């Protein structure tokens, strides 16, 4: 909720990486699960949120 | 009256006085080394003074491009058509050979806050987004204390050191990318995508990050900003040659006896910095074999062009390398220049973002092409092929990275075709 | 204009009786006058350019021996080119083959922005690049 509101209204979407990682910092990696929790928690397409865990190497997607 | 050797500087006009954290890094040592100075004062001249005097200054970017400042920052000028402004200081430092951003997130953060504050006044920008990179969580964090503290103090948020300015400063961390340091790639990490930069007719002044007119700058534009103003500008002026003006942040790294950075003045003798501050590279000036000079991006200069070069961007630019990030990786003669070129094609390969043709092709292909120079298994009618390919993938794409990967091959090319080509001869002398 | 015996003659020409065809091909068929739709595989428009003349698809069969496409119209396969449509028009009127044609369709002009895929606040905002 922090994180949320540091960008504007209507441009959440910007908040995917940081969400991301705190997702990463509490489980330890992401499971497809924790990418598909970030994309229901900022309501944007599952595939957006595959993108950037793919896209950025401190991803743990193992 | 005029300067002629551009070196020695002293500890006074030293900008960046806590670089080696050994004083203070929190809000009560930054103010006794005169941060947060009348900070209201600069404010309430106005983003017209505050412009002003960047463009006296002479200031060009830090971050690579050096584009002049002043010029760069006056872009947001324009009055409002009611979508919000933001300056996003670019904090991602992901050029190999330079970590002097890190030193000043973590040293001297408050430079940072208010290097925000002063340049966001100036491009009358509502709030700051520093993107660090993900590595550096120690150094984030560092800064977001400062934040706080900068924040609790009253210098930032409502009412912003008494001037009646509105700004925020927001750090939002990266992920593990290089290409995240390019501006629009930056942008658009912001937004929540992948780092993939912009197609640049619509400028990140008009349509930045959200949308909005933004303006990006590198950590050491941002921070020298509140020296250059309550300085001068004309004091900063007085240092370097023409143009290239100032001081900056030195990276010396690879084959020195004391790999260091420090702050020297602009256009200083890169022997001047090597063996002065770095203690000179190991065995001596003589064993010297290149030198890169300004980051990993820059093409390399052997030993007779370091010989007598200025650390400028002109005096670069004329010794047909660029000065970059002022990161200067040496080489000694005890070093595979192939191995190492090709370790830096190995990296831009691995930092591609893909978005493009010319890059993310042939910067595979000149990764695989120069892991074969360094065996020896290719034939030297190859040589000019891979200029030729660089060449293809230079002036071709969207951002910068496939110049800065293109030119570290231009530059092995340039003063190295012997030694490729005596690798090839005996590669095929062992390999009949 | 010139010296020719210039003799007064009907606007309808007509050339049916000189060309050979034989009379079921003149007044039974149907030509169709249009620039061929642009191919939706490729993006390339160098073959909507012209104008073409073809004539209606009779009946193809199944070769008994090879189960070869066999036919009886000597015109499946007769595809003429004009550079307008009139000329086409022309040359089915002075052929007497019956023809229905059809106007020209072009792209339409678009307005294209690459600028307007990072919207602040329009839906032509892009979730990917
Ligand atoms: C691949 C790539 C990586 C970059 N990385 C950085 C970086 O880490 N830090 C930085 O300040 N600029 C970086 N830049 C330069 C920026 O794109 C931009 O030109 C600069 O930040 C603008 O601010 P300045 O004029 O103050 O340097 C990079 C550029 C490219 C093409
Ligand atoms: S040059 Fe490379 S990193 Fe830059 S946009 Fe093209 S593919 Fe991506």
Request: one cysteine or more; aromatic letters at 8%.
């Amino acid at each position: 909720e922090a994180i949320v509101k540091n960008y504007p209204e209507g441009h959440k979407a910007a908040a995917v990486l940081p969400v991301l990682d705190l997702a990463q910092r509490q489980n330890g990696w992401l499971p497809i699960s924790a990418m598909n929790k970030v994309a229901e928690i900022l309501q944007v397409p599952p595939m957006r949120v595959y993108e950037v865990a793919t896209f950025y190497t401190m991803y743990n997607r193992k | 009256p005029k300067k002629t050797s551009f070196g020695s500087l002293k500890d006074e006009d030293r900008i960046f006085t806590n670089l080696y954290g050994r004083h203070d890094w929190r809000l009560k040592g930054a103010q006794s080394r005169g941060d947060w100075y009348k900070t209201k004062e600069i404010l309430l001249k106005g983003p017209d003074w505050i412009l002003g005097e960047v463009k006296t200054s002479g200031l060009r970017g830090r971050g690579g491009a050096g584009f002049p400042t002043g010029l760069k920052w006056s872009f947001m000028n324009k009055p409002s058509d009611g979508r919000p402004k933001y300056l996003v200081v670019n904090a991602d430092e992901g050029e190999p050979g330079t970590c002097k951003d890190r030193e000043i997130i973590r040293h001297d953060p408050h430079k940072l806050v208010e290097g925000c504050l002063v340049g966001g006044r100036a491009m009358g920008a509502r709030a700051a987004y520093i993107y660090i990179r993900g590595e550096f969580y120690n150094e984030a964090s560092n800064l977001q204390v400062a934040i706080r503290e900068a924040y609790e103090a009253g210098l930032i948020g409502k009412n912003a050191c008494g001037s009646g300015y509105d700004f925020d400063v927001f750090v939002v961390r990266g992920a593990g990318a290089y290409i995240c340091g390019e501006e629009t790639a930056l942008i658009e990490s912001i937004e929540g995508k992948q780092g993939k930069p912009r197609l640049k007719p619509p400028f990140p002044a008009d349509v930045g990050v959200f949308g909005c007119p933004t303006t990006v700058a590198n950590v050491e534009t941002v921070a020298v900003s509140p020296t250059i103003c309550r300085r001068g500008g004309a004091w900063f002026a007085s240092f370097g040659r023409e143009r290239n003006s100032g001081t900056k942040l030195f990276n010396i790294s690879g084959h020195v006896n004391h790999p260091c950075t420090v702050e020297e003045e602009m256009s200083v003798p890169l022997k001047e910095l090597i063996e002065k501050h770095a203690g000179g590279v190991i065995g001596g000036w003589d064993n010297l074999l290149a030198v890169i000079p300004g980051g990993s991006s820059t093409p390399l200069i052997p030993k007779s062009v370091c010989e007598t070069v200025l650390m400028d961007f002109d005096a670069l630019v004329q010794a047909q390398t660029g000065l970059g990030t002022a990161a200067v990786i040496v080489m000694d003669r005890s070093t595979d220049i192939v191995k190492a070129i090709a370790r830096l094609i190995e990296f831009y390969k691995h930092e591609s973002c893909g978005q493009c043709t010319p890059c993310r092709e042939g910067v595979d292909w000149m990764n695989k092409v120069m892991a074969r120079f360094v065996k020896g298994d290719a034939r030297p009618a190859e040589i000019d092929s891979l200029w030729e390919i660089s060449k293809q993938i230079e002036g071709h794409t969207i951002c910068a990275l496939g110049d800065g990967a293109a030119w570290p091959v231009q530059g092995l090319i340039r003063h190295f075709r012997p030694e490729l080509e005596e690798r090839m001869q005996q590669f095929a002398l062992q390999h009949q | 204009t010139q010296d020719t015996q210039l003799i007064a003659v009907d606007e309808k020409l007509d050339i049916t009786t000189l060309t050979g065809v034989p009379e079921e091909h003149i007044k039974t068929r149907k030509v169709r006058i249009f620039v061929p739709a642009r191919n939706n595989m490729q993006s390339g428009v160098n073959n909507t350019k012209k104008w073409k003349m073809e004539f209606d698809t009779r009946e193809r069969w199944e070769n008994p021996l090879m189960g070869w496409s066999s036919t009886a119209d000597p015109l499946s396969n007769l595809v003429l080119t004009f550079s307008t449509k009139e000329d086409a028009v022309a040359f089915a009127e002075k052929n007497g083959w019956s023809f229905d044609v059809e106007e020209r369709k072009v792209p339409k002009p678009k307005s294209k922005s690459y600028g307007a895929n990072f919207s602040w606040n329009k839906r032509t905002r892009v979730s990917t690049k």
